[PDB]
């Protein structure tokens, strides 16, 4: 049978990180997967448009940061931006 990639295990790991003693149903898992896919598509499309506008042919962390600032509303975006940096810097350290 053909494997179907999905954001199932990662959402469960995040949930266990946040709520160690709480489960999640199949419908909620599907909703979470759809939400993750939609946000990924929105951010990637905005980054691609930003790269095309400036006549550049490479998606970097700056494009993703600007797309996040444009899409995510208010405080959310700010926090997200911080998290992004808090990852990339760490990825540079290793």
């Amino acid at each position: 049978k053909t494997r179907k990639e999905s954001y199932a295990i990662y959402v469960y790991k995040v949930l266990k990180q946040v709520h160690p003693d709480t489960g999640i149903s199949s419908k909620a898992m599907s909703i979470m997967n759809s939400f993750v896919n939609d946000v990924f598509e929105r951010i990637a499309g905005e980054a691609s448009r930003l790269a095309h506008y400036n006549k550049r042919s490479t998606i970097t962390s700056r494009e993703i940061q600007t797309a996040v600032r444009l899409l995510l509303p208010g405080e959310l975006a700010k926090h997200a931006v911080s998290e992004g940096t808090k990852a990339v810097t760490k990825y540079t350290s290793a």
Partner: protein, 80 residues
């Protein structure tokens, strides 16, 4: 086949009750049926176009989800 009458008056009344409507006029039901028929016609036409492009014969949930996304009514729960 006059199946538009399958959306009975109690069903429309319940849908209005969920929306916070306290009193409903008697002429609301026909307008609601017409609006529902128009919306279903649009969505089903888009889904059938998506299915026909794929050279299939069954309208899957993915086609309906894509049509709803095209109309600007993204639906979470079915497919991805």
């Amino acid at each position: 086949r006059d199946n538009i009458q399958g959306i009975t008056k109690p069903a429309i009344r319940r849908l209005a009750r969920r929306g916070g409507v306290k009193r409903i006029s008697g002429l609301i039901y026909e307008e609601t049926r017409g609006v529902l028929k128009v919306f279903l016609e649009n969505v089903i036409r888009d889904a059938v176009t998506y299915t026909e492009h794929a050279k299939r014969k069954t309208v899957t949930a993915m086609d309906v989800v894509y049509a709803l996304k095209r109309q600007g009514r993204t639906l979470y729960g079915f497919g991805g």
